[PDB]
């Protein structure tokens, strides 16, 4: 029974590969030569946020596009007024091994998580005036790797226990477990409509999940190593992933197959963070070579080098209005480029 | 030209920076040890005795020097980012049950994986051959030859077995131009493990200073 079970498993594998290939008449590479190239894009350090004592691992831009939250090994969450490089809050984390940080779309909450396997929600707007812990969501048997807010009450967390989950902050209990990945989940990127989310989980695979139901609609193959970063296209039906094989790859949900490969022979180090531009023409990506490379999402050519970091660019985010890009690295500094 | 409220916000940021600078001295002076051990390595007893005088943390003071021993026994992962959280760790305290001869090979494999991870290149390894009296009473009875044919001395002499174990552990270390590897044949009731750990951490900091001095 198990032999024939794997038999139709492989049969469905060939069926889906054949469907994708038959739907693949031409590549985005061939259809893009006609349109004007992005040219040369040059960015400079507008502001250099300093004050962190250790390596940054995650940064998230607020919806107002002026406040950003940063996490580092000193166990401190620092919120920056990027316009005036002023620290707003300094939240002393319970666990110093923080590996992800989030900003609520409303702006009233920030969530941090790490090796403690707990995603902790921090309330920023309280009568006492000091940021307090609102909820310690527990239930994951793996290290927290990425957490993103949907509303002020629902948050999706991905961990190393091969299972992403949607929580309920008011109850504090898990609601739906997005199981199906066979490896440690590394990153998540909620869709702009907040009804779907993708995640790469070290199996070179990214699964698109339906938040309302809880089943992964479609699994994306490709890649050769652990997908360390995943971002969602602004339009809502495409996503780009970064891995440890130094290749950024763009998938589409409707075509459920690879579209382009943003790989260059010069770089050999993996990608730690990926985020698109406001219209998605640019595919900014932070690598371990101590700098970020800007890619044209339609032609896959190096549009520019976002150099200026003394260590590996661990995190990289783009504002909602797209008027700035924030890169965090292991040199305990954040630089905002424009 | 800044407004009154913008000036006050800058003042609040200055106070936050002052607090961060106050914590900076402790952060930079603190040494962290990642304690990696097996289930039978007697990690729990050594940990309990050392403090007296998810993942866990044990902060303690040795010779007015900040210390933090990180135990990841419950949650251990082979992924790159999980190991990358401990690249800034000063030294790795590896605990091995020498007395448990039958389990030496798996401990050797784990030691090889830890020391050849390429994320622990800049950290030192403080090996701790623990259960030394158990080791001696087993050595006077049983021979390391049955489980390890490469041993060359008399399997009933303690020094021969200890040297063979140290040699076999050191051979697993692929690169010898990196941070030093330290070995100690101390039991859990030595009550001097803090002194040895401090000595080896000071030696590692000495090595870092020598690297910074362009003396090589």
């Amino acid at each position, epitope marked *: 029974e198990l032999d024939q079970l794997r038999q139709e498993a492989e049969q469905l594998k060939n069926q889906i590969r054949d469907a994708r290939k038959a739907c693949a008449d031409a590549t985005l590479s061939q259809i893009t030569n006609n349109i004007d190239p992005v040219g040369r894009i040059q960015m400079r350090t507008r502001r250099t946020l300093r004050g962190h004592l250790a390596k940054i691992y995650a940064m998230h831009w607020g919806t107002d596009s002026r406040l950003l939250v940063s996490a580092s090994q000193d166990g401190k969450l620092i919120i920056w007024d990027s316009y005036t490089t*002023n620290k707003v809050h300094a939240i002393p984390l319970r666990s110093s091994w923080v590996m992800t940080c989030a900003y609520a779309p409303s702006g009233n909450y920030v969530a941090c998580g790490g090796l403690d396997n707990i995603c902790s929600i921090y309330n920023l707007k309280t*009568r006492e005036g000091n940021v307090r812990v609102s909820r310690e969501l527990a239930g994951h048997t793996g290290y927290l790797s990425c957490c993103r807010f949907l509303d002020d009450n629902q948050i999706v967390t991905s961990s190393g226990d091969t299972t992403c989950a949607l929580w309920d902050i008011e109850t504090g209990q898990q609601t739906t477990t997005f199981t199906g990945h066979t490896g440690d989940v590394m990153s998540l990127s909620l869709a702009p409509d907040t009804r779907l989310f993708v995640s790469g989980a070290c199996d070179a695979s990214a699964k698109l999940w339906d938040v309302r139901e809880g089943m992964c609609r479609q699994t994306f193959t490709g890649h050769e190593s652990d997908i360390n970063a995943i971002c969602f296209f602004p339009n809502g039906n495409a996503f780009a992933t970064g891995s440890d094989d130094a290749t950024c790859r763009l998938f589409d949900l409707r075509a459920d197959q690879e579209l382009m490969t943003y790989s260059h022979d010069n770089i050999i180090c993996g990608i730690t963070s990926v985020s698109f531009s406001k219209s998605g023409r640019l595919l900014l990506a932070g690598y371990d070579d101590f700098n970020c490379n800007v890619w044209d999402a339609l032609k896959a050519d190096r549009a520019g080098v976002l150099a200026g970091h003394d260590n590996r660019v661990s995190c990289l985010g783009v504002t909602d209005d797209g008027m700035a890009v924030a890169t965090g690295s292991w040199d305990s500094f954040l630089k905002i480029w424009n | 030209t800044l407004s009154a409220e913008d000036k006050a*916000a800058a003042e609040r940021s200055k106070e936050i920076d002052k607090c961060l600078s106050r914590e900076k001295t402790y952060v930079k002076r603190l040494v962290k040890i990642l304690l990696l051990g097996a289930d039978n390595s007697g990690k729990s007893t050594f940990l309990k005795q050392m403090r007296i005088i998810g993942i866990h943390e044990y902060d303690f003071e040795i010779k007015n020097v900040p210390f933090k021993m990180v135990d990841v026994g419950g949650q251990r992962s082979e992924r790159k980012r999980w190991f990358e959280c401990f690249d800034s760790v000063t030294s790795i305290l590896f605990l091995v049950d020498s007395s448990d001869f039958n389990r030496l090979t798996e401990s050797l494999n784990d030691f090889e994986t830890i020391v050849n991870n390429r994320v622990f290149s800049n950290v030192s390894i403080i090996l701790f051959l623990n259960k030394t009296d158990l080791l001696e009473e087993k050595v006077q009875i049983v021979s390391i030859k049955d489980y390890f044919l490469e041993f060359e001395g008399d399997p009933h002499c303690l020094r021969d077995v200890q040297k063979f174990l140290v040699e076999c552990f050191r051979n697993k270390r692929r690169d010898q131009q990196q941070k030093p590897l330290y070995h100690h044949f101390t039991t859990a009731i030595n009550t001097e493990n803090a002194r040895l750990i401090f000595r080896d951490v000071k030696d590692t900091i000495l090595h870092d200073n020598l690297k910074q001095l362009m003396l090589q």
Partner: single-chain antibody
Amino acid sequence: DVQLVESGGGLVQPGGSRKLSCSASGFAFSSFGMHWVRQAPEKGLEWVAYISSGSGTIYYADTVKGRFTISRDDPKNTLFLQMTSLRSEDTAMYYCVRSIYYYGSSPFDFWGQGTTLTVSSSSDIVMTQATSSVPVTPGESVSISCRSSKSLLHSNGNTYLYWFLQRPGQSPQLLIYRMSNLASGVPDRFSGSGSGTAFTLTISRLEAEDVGVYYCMQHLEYPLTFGAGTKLELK
């Protein structure tokens, strides 16, 4: 909850000295800056002093510069005001005001019920409102207006105008901060807008908690001059 209780009230003779102590309980006193606003027996609010978080910057009003000293004790969670050589112009009830300052904060958030001190016997931004005892029916829509001598719109893009509600016999509470933002806990019926100088506050509905005296504060200049009293009254 958040409480701000002060102490010290007596009929001191002119030229004497006294100390106003304000005790804080229920919030991080160190992070919050503290002000001191006083009101003559029947007059409007007037700013006196200010101490920042950590006792960094200490400002004073020109009428009380030198005579008055404000010191805060963070571990004691207490705010102190050393006043000497009081005149008859100091006959007032002194309000303690907390104000935390960061991006998006709500300065002048909570006020404390003051203690009355009854003394025996320019560059300041002039904010004036030309209203007094507006006849108002319950449920109607009204628009309280305030004016500023110098425009309060800074290059940062936010006007530093504040609206305060002082209910009869009750300490003032913050309604609008920065001309537009609703304060926490206040109904959406309150709404405010304005321009570089012209300011206005409109209230959609008129229930029992709205009858009182309204105030407008400038926060561009540290003298922190107030306006007159509108004195909303039921028709």
